[PDB]
Amino acid sequence: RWQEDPEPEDENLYEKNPDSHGYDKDPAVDIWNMRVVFFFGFSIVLVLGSTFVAYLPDYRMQEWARREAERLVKYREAHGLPIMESNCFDPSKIQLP
Amino acid sequence: XXXXXXXXXXXXXXXXXXXXXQAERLAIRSRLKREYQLQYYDPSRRGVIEDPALVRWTYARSANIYPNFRPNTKTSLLGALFGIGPLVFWYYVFKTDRDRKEKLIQEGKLDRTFNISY
Amino acid sequence: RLFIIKPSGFYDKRFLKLLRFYILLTGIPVAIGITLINVXXXXXXXXXXXXXXXXXXXXXXXXXXXXXXXXX
Amino acid sequence: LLQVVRDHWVHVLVPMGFVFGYYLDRKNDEKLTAFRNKSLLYKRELKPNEEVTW
Amino acid sequence: XXXXXXXXXXXXXXXXXXXXXXXXXXPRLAFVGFLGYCSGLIDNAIRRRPVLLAGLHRQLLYITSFVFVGYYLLKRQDYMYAVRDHDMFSYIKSHXXXXXXXXXXXXXXXXXXX
Amino acid sequence: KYIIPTIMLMPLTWLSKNNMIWVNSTAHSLLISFTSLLLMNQFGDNSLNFSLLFFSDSLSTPLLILTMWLLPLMLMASQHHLSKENLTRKKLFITMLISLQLFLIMTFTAMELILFYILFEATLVPTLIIITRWGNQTERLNAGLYFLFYTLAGSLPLLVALIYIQNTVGSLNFLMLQYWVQPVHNSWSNVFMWLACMMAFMVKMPLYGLHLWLPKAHVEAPIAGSMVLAAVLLKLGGYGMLRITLILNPMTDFMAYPFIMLSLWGMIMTSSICLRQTDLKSLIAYSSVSHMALVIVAILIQTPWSYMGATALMIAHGLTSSMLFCLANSNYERIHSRTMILARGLQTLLPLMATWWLLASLTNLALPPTINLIGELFVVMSTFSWSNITIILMGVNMVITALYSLYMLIMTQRGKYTYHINNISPSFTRENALMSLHILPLLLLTLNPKIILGPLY
Amino acid sequence: XXXXXXXXXXXXXXXXXXXXXXXXXXXXXXXXXXXXXXXXXXXXXXXXXXXXXXXXXXXXXXXXXXXXXXXXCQEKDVLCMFEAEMQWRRDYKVDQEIVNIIQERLKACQQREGESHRQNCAKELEQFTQVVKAYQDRYXXXXXXXXXXXXXXXXXXXXXXXXXXXXXX
């Protein structure tokens, strides 16, 4: 015996008493939510946010290193023999053993 | 799996036992179809039908695991040799490649001068 | 003439129109974004005199819109 | 005036929480004022403004 | 330290070492004040009363009591950590031989491949 | 900057009127998610600390942006569910997402290991309440108890491991301070110290052994299908393996050798089962094992190239598998079963959703450079420098990655559904809007993948 | 410009003597498209450059030099090692794009010659082999993930191997 346990109802919005909606009940709340503020974040974060991402604020010295490398190539080629790296960041270290 | 001759119409007799055998199979087939027929031809429904065959089919793989595997004997133990066994198989494959690679770096160079990435 | 096949179509085609309406709404500053390269100066590379390292933007290159975002 | 304030009350709190969050997390640099100008990485002598930049 | 050696046993406040200056509107005090406000929300759930936030004005007792006890609790916190540091620094200077300094060295270390 | 406005979302849902609620929770979350792409992106050569160690900066973690992307996305599909029940039940399970997001922001940002630990395990508590309740099918407890007794069984060994490091070597704290860390001498006492640090991120990052935690949580649906994406956030939420292996034990890789092979077989055998499986949610549950196993292989190699693909895969998987679960949810609220064979029919019944079904399935394959190709390709290239034999096994995996997603397509691209009569409306605006908000960020990462793949890039 | 080597000067001159027919179809279309949609594009580009008027030069490149050697100050100190490791990470990011320029020097030779390939150039081939081989030993490659604390060990391992060979010979 179930007594009260047998209770189930099939519910679907579809078109019946909704016209055309996404949120359940109230036509006034649905249009102002599902079509306005649902699409306002779709317009700001995706379209106005696309300008940022990586383009514009340099981003971890990606563009800076290009101009920095080019000026060091022409200077070292004119004066020194070794190009860029040969024995870098170590000069007169305190022995080995 | 297939035999020497493909089964399609081979080895079939009328007799008397086979005549009653078809009567048994068509009786259940019509019994399970009529309960579908009464549920299909009505506009008041709207909803996907359950059917006891497909629910038990999904339950056969997702569940019924621990009620099973109580007589393991030897067939279950042979599956473990095909289970954790291949991990031991590849363990000596990669290890022989490491002894080949590590020796070449220290003496008699094999790595190219053009290599720099990773 | 025939009755033809049936699709929701009304729910499908409205979604694409509602999507495009909000792309075009924020597509106006995209159109202004092209003219910002046109009207205002884009980029210049020159050796700077020793006075100040950063003013408004510390390092500005390519686009002028990079400096405007660097201030805030 | 009375209808507008009664309708929106919880809605105003979220952008107001952002201003309070931005201000409180900025003030943490005042506790970490040590080594403001040290070595040669980002150090310059003051001309008009006090302590270069916060 | 677990056992007292410099301070006298059984005391609510420090008194002997009062000079430390207690915190004024600390970030820690705001969380204890929030906990006092949180207790004034859940009491209306046990005793079924309308509105958690806009309920009875007996919540001010819950905010004050948590701040008042918490202020003395935070005063004990800043005192005990200071005594811990005071005893530690005095131990090094009294012994001297226990502590040793070593700075600026270049030593070889094994580098990993791949 | 990020904590405090996120905490102010808690009184927002409770104070607002009964008719609204869902409008305020979605709109205010979208404007906060905008500021994440505004401030966090700024970095130098080595990423400089944010402030005091309450919440710190990001060095190699733009994975916070993904959590901010799913911050409103999880609230969208949970509209169809929970709507029948009481207003207090709605307000609780919206705030449990906010509490999840509160702890999830704290995990990625804070450059720590001691305080990071009490945020890693702290994410398990809100998910436990979500998974155990609102289960459409039974055996909720055979997934709820499994959710803790797998993770906490592996993560509680971090208390004996992490504290042991700081008691001998200075303090863990900032990680930027951690240059004090000396290479391991390789001793039998140090064997279980390495294992205790790993095992916590060997359960949440699913291998082949102790992997059963994952598929049980996905099949038994928490709420509809959008709370399943929170379990996807926990796979990538176990990112501490990027921090422990790099800093705490850099010399140790001899003990990594068997654990690479354990994850290597969690690629062929995990893909074999995902071919004859009946449940549609299970087909995404086992595909999520293989994609995260690729990260596990990459981390243990420790080459600078592997991390570039590993960090990319964390973002790649988090927006593609979550996209796949939304498609499973879009059929779950119409047919009311997780059965693949029963729910069969696209274009004839679901016209515009079928194109979303394509783009989600094609991302499991190697498409023209979006993020999934970029993420996977570095791992394959890194494995060859590790050992030449790998691509003979890794290539077989590439065959069944097609079978991971084309089998999902074929069993939906058939003009049948004779037994079915429901699913009249194909997509009620937001149903397709969910699918667009998952794919269009991946399409924007085609132009700039430098923001996604960045461990010193 | 300046940094890029390139070829000296390209010849490229047509005589056109054999077969009149219609003079040259390639030359007639080149002269026609130069006035149709090339001169019009040049006029619009000049109009936008003139409309700029005021232009900001700005700092562009930052200095940041030396700031003490990393292989001098040690014994684990937060105040000293932090700025020293910053210098190494700067140079490592610069060295990544130095290789790229030398890489593109070989790319320029392959595009210009084509048929010659290996018979000519030689200077760009030698420049690539000298830098990359030195790059393999000093910066990463076999030294796993990028870390300046581990970089000193890689230099010491090369110094110990060179000293062992010099003692024998």
Swiss-Prot record, chain A:
- Where do the record's region annotations for Disordered lie? 1-24
**Any one GO CC term of the record:** mitochondrial inner membrane
Instruction: Indicate yes or no for the key word Disulfide bond.
Output: no
Q: Look up the domain of life of the source.
A: Eukaryota
- What keywords is this UniProt entry annotated with? Electron transport, Membrane, Mitochondrion, Mitochondrion inner membrane, Respiratory chain, Transit peptide, Transmembrane, Transmembrane helix, Transport
What's the protein's topology in the membrane? Answer: Single-pass membrane protein
Q: Where is the composition biased (Basic and acidic residues)?
A: 13-24
Compartment(s) where it occurs, according to its Swiss-Prot or TrEMBL record = Mitochondrion inner membrane
Transmembrane intervals: 36-56
Oligomer and partners = Complex I is composed of 45 different subunits. Interacts with BCAP31.
Describe the task this protein carries out.
Accessory subunit of the mitochondrial membrane respiratory chain NADH dehydrogenase (Complex I), that is believed not to be involved in catalysis. Complex I functions in the transfer of electrons from NADH to the respiratory chain. The immediate electron acceptor for the enzyme is believed to be ubiquinone.
Q: Which family does it belong to?
A: Belongs to the complex I NDUFB11 subunit family.
How is this protein named in the record?
A: NADH dehydrogenase [ubiquinone] 1 beta subcomplex subunit 11, mitochondrial
Source species of the chain: Bos taurus (Bovine)
Covered part of the full sequence, start to end and full length, is 54 to 150 of 154
From Swiss-Prot, chain B:
Task: Please list every transmembrane segment annotated in the UniProt record, as residue ranges.
Answer: 75-94
Top-rank lineage group of the source organism: Eukaryota
**The keyword Acetylation is assigned to this record:** yes
Keyword annotations: Acetylation, Electron transport, Membrane, Mitochondrion, Mitochondrion inner membrane, Phosphoprotein, Respiratory chain, Transmembrane, Transmembrane helix, Transport
- Function of this protein? Accessory subunit of the mitochondrial membrane respiratory chain NADH dehydrogenase (Complex I), that is believed not to be involved in catalysis. Complex I functions in the transfer of electrons from NADH to the respiratory chain. The immediate electron acceptor for the enzyme is believed to be ubiquinone.
Report quaternary structure and partners: Complex I is composed of 45 different subunits.
What is this protein identified as? Answer: NADH dehydrogenase [ubiquinone] 1 beta subcomplex subunit 4
Q: Which gene is transcribed and translated to give this protein?
A: NDUFB4
From Swiss-Prot, chain D:
Residue ranges of coiled coil: none
Key word Cell wall biogenesis/degradation present in the record?
Answer: no
Q: Is Mitochondrion among the key words of this record?
A: yes
Looking up Pfam families in the UniProt record yields: NADH_oxidored (PF08040)
**Membrane spanning stretches:** 8-24
Q: What is its main location?
A: mitochondrion
Entry keywords, A to Z:
Electron transport, Membrane, Mitochondrion, Mitochondrion inner membrane, Respiratory chain, Transmembrane, Transmembrane helix, Transport
Entry's localization field: Mitochondrion inner membrane
- Choose one Gene Ontology CC annotation of this protein and give it: mitochondrion
Q: How does it sit in the membrane?
A: Single-pass membrane protein
Q: How does it assemble?
A: Complex I is composed of 45 different subunits.
Query: What is the documented function of this protein?
Result: Accessory subunit of the mitochondrial membrane respiratory chain NADH dehydrogenase (Complex I) that is believed not to be involved in catalysis. Complex I functions in the transfer of electrons from NADH to the respiratory chain. The immediate electron acceptor for the enzyme is believed to be ubiquinone.
The similarity comment for this entry is: Belongs to the complex I NDUFB1 subunit family.
Which protein, by its recorded name, is this?
NADH dehydrogenase [ubiquinone] 1 beta subcomplex subunit 1
Taxonomic lineage from the root: Eukaryota, Metazoa, Chordata, Craniata, Vertebrata
Q: From the UniProt record, report the name of the gene that encodes this protein.
A: NDUFB1
UniProtKB/Swiss-Prot annotation, chain F:
UniProt-listed Enzyme Commission number(s): 7.1.1.2
Cell compartments where the protein resides: Mitochondrion inner membrane
Provide the transmembrane region boundaries: 20-40, 58-78, 92-110, 114-136, 145-165, 194-214, 222-242, 254-274, 282-301, 306-328, 349-369, 391-411, 433-453
Q: Which UniProt keywords apply?
A: Electron transport, Formylation, Membrane, Mitochondrion, Mitochondrion inner membrane, NAD, Respiratory chain, Translocase, Transmembrane, Transmembrane helix, Transport, Ubiquinone
Reaction catalysed?
Answer: a ubiquinone + NADH + 5 H(+)(in) = a ubiquinol + NAD(+) + 4 H(+)(out)
Disulphide linkage map: none
Family the UniProt entry places it in? Belongs to the complex I subunit 4 family.
Q: What do the Gene Ontology cellular component annotations say? A: mitochondrial inner membrane; respiratory chain complex I
Report the membrane topology from the UniProt record.
Answer: Multi-pass membrane protein
Per UniProt, subunit arrangement is: Core subunit of respiratory chain NADH dehydrogenase (Complex I) which is composed of 45 different subunits.
Q: Where is the signal peptide?
A: none
* Gene Ontology MF annotations: NADH dehydrogenase (ubiquinone) activity; ubiquinone binding
Pfam families reported for this sequence: Oxidored_q5_N (PF01059), Proton_antipo_M (PF00361)
Q: What class of enzyme is it?
A: translocase
Q: Which organism is it from?
A: Bos taurus (Bovine)
The name of this protein is: NADH-ubiquinone oxidoreductase chain 4
Q: What is its main location?
A: mitochondrion
Role: Core subunit of the mitochondrial membrane respiratory chain NADH dehydrogenase (Complex I) which catalyzes electron transfer from NADH through the respiratory chain, using ubiquinone as an electron acceptor. Essential for the catalytic activity and assembly of complex I.
Q: What is the taxonomic lineage of the source species?
A: Eukaryota, Metazoa, Chordata, Craniata, Vertebrata
